[PDB]
């Protein structure tokens, strides 16, 4: 059935989103390791704002540890804590 | 708490995950309009395959009719229906 307008409004708004981030984003001085997995879970701002030339940000962030399968390749891999950092707060603002 | 390595690498693995989508991109022949939202959550894949030579894609596919303001800048604005396509399987295929 059609989703009704202020339903899609409401859902698509900046907001914290659960998004698959690779970790060599998150990690990109990593020259040395691949990761399993590859990407990871985290909160962060996503969606759209009322005005066009704005952007969803985060005014409130924090970190979250996660176990990262570390691999160095041909030599080894190492279960090992890795932080994420999570969006907690969204806003929009000036692009 | 630390996520578990075995949490981590379930959650993140090749799924369909609402993922906010920006309508311009999808549809790139709406030149003269712009809509609000101006975003859409939708059903896509995402996450991470165990090799790095796959990449996750769509199997299974359907479509959704959302409602979306249609406006025309300083002319007028209508609400109507705009369909968008979803994800409903994924799997990991090599690029």
Do not use: A, W
């Not at 985060?58 to 160095?72: D, F, G, L, V, W």
């Amino acid at each position: 059935e059609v989703v009704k307008f202020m339903d899609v409004y409401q859902r698509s708004y900046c907001h914290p989103i659960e998004t698959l981030v690779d970790i060599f984003q998150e990690y990109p001085d990593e020259i040395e390791y691949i990761f399993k997995p590859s990407c990871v879970p985290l909160m962060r701002c996503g969606g759209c704002c009322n005005d066009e030339g704005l952007e969803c940000v985060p005014t409130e962030e924090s970190n979250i540890t996660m176990q990262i399968m570390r691999i160095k390749p041909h030599q080894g891999q190492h279960i090992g804590e890795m932080s994420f950092l999570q969006h907690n707060k969204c806003e929009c603002r000036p692009k």
